[PDB]
């Protein structure tokens, strides 16, 4: 929210250069579950975890892509079989 | 301004492809529509 | 008086320029060797350093001191911040 | 161009065709009303589609 609230000052390239690499591991984590379906977590920054299918839990970026990620992981976890 | 217009575009275009290919694998091989 | 004038005009009040908020910068002007001639030129010079202090204090006070903690547009907001950014370069 | 606004607790002489409006006091005197109408229409149209 420091990115959206001010973008018209000398701090904007500096804080953008901070956030741009501060979101690199989160995107690296997401690039596994969408392109191989492998889920990685040791930190608890996800609510997702790995009945007849229901052990997938839901107990950051905008919510407009998050639910699409949530279904595109389970699709590959079916395609693993 | 910060928004995704160069990052989410090769991902949201990929989600639809995964969904469509998985549905296609169901239809022509397991024949759910015959049941 | 020579290096001291620069020390005062830079925005750091000296030991001869008694800092006040009702007279600004002002010389003591009670030395036992005072010349009448030096008085007027010093009284003219003090005002610009007094103004420079308030300008720098204003710009520091209202630009770059918050991380988005109602709000006012003549104490905060982006237009006042743009005013201060132009002010320091002038 | 989009319809986004990033000013919090400030205004930009513009406050769907609702929650955004032109008012005479916030507009500069050397920016007339005729240009502000076109800016308002363009923003509302791009926001709508």
Swiss-Prot record, chain A:
Shown chain mapped onto the complete sequence = 507 to 607 of 1819
> What gene name is listed for this protein?
TUBGCP6
Instruction: Give the multimer and partner information.
Output: Component of the gamma-tubulin ring complex (gTuRC) consisting of TUBGCP2, TUBGCP3, TUBGCP4, TUBGCP5 and TUBGCP6 and gamma-tubulin TUBG1 or TUBG2. TUBGCP2, TUBGCP3, TUBGCP4, TUBGCP5 and TUBGCP6 assemble in a 5:5:2:1:1 stoichiometry; each is associated with a gamma-tubulin, thereby arranging 14 gamma-tubulins in a helical manner. Gamma-tubulin at the first position is blocked by TUBGCP3 at the last position, allowing 13 protafilaments to grow into a microtubule.
What organism, scientifically named, is this protein from? Homo sapiens (Human)
Which disorder does the record name?
Answer: Microcephaly and chorioretinopathy, autosomal recessive, 1: A syndrome characterized by microcephaly, cognitive impairment, underdeveloped retina and choroid, and epilepsy in some patients. The more anterior parts of the retina, near the periphery and pars plana, have a grayish hue and diminutive vasculature similar to retinopathy of prematurity. Visual impairment becomes evident during the first year of life.
Name-wise, this protein is Gamma-tubulin complex component 6
Q: Which family does it belong to?
A: Belongs to the TUBGCP family.
Q: From which domain of life does this come?
A: Eukaryota
Where does this protein reside within or beyond the cell? Cytoplasm, Cytoskeleton, Microtubule organizing center, Centrosome
Any idea what job this protein has? Component of the gamma-tubulin ring complex (gTuRC) which mediates microtubule nucleation. The gTuRC regulates the minus-end nucleation of alpha-beta tubulin heterodimers that grow into microtubule protafilaments, a critical step in centrosome duplication and spindle formation.
From Swiss-Prot, chain C:
**How would you summarize where this protein is expressed among tissues?**
Ubiquitously expressed.
Where is this protein found? Cytoplasm, Cytoskeleton, Microtubule organizing center, Centrosome
Record's superkingdom? Eukaryota
Question: TM segments?
Answer: none
Tied to what disorder? Microcephaly and chorioretinopathy, autosomal recessive, 3: A disorder characterized by congenital microcephaly and chorioretinal dysplasia associated with poor vision and nystagmus. Variable ocular anomalies include microphthalmia, retinal folding, retinal detachment, optic nerve hypoplasia, absence of retinal vessels, round areas of chorioretinal atrophy, and attenuated electroretinogram. Most patients have mild developmental delay and mild learning difficulties.
Task: Spell out the subunit comment.
Answer: Component of the gamma-tubulin ring complex (gTuRC) consisting of TUBGCP2, TUBGCP3, TUBGCP4, TUBGCP5 and TUBGCP6 and gamma-tubulin TUBG1 or TUBG2. TUBGCP2, TUBGCP3, TUBGCP4, TUBGCP5 and TUBGCP6 assemble in a 5:5:2:1:1 stoichiometry; each is associated with a gamma-tubulin, thereby arranging 14 gamma-tubulins in a helical manner. Gamma-tubulin at the first position is blocked by TUBGCP3 at the last position, allowing 13 protafilaments to grow into a microtubule.
As for family, the record states: Belongs to the TUBGCP family.
Described by its record, this protein's role is as follows: Component of the gamma-tubulin ring complex (gTuRC) which mediates microtubule nucleation. The gTuRC regulates the minus-end nucleation of alpha-beta tubulin heterodimers that grow into microtubule protafilaments, a critical step in centrosome duplication and spindle formation.
What is the official name of this protein in its record? Gamma-tubulin complex component 4
Please report the organism this UniProt entry assigns to the protein.
Homo sapiens
Name the encoding gene, please.
Answer: TUBGCP4
């Amino acid at each position: 929210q420091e990115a959206l609230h001010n973008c018209s000052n000398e701090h904007y390239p500096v804080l953008l250069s901070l956030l741009k690499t501060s979101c690199e591991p989160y995107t690296r984590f997401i690039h596994d579950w969408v392109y191989s379906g492998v889920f990685r977590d040791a930190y608890g920054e996800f609510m997702i975890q790995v009945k007849l299918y229901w052990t997938h839990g839901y107990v950051v970026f905008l919510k407009h892509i998050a639910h699409d990620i949530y279904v595109c992981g389970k699709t590959i976890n079916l395609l693993k079989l | 301004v910060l928004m995704k217009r160069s990052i989410t575009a090769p991902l949201a275009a990929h989600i639809s492809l995964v969904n469509k290919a998985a549905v296609d694998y169901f239809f022509v091989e397991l024949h759910l529509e015959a049941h | 008086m020579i290096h001291e004038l620069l020390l005062a005009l830079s925005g750091y009040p000296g030991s001869i320029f008694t800092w006040n908020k009702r007279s600004g910068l002002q010389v003591s002007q009670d030395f036992p060797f005072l010349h009448p001639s030096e008085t007027s030129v010093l009284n003219r010079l003090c005002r610009l350093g007094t103004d420079y202090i308030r300008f720098t204090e204003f710009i520091e006070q209202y630009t770059g001191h918050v991380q988005q903690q109602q709000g006012q547009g003549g104490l905060h907001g982006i237009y006042l911040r743009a005013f201060c950014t132009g002010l320091d370069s002038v | 161009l989009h319809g986004l606004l990033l000013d919090q607790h400030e205004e930009f002489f513009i406050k769907s065709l609702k929650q955004f409006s032109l008012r005479v006091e916030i507009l500069p005197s050397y920016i007339p009303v005729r240009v502000a109408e076109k800016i308002l229409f363009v923003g509302e149209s791009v926001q709508m589609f």
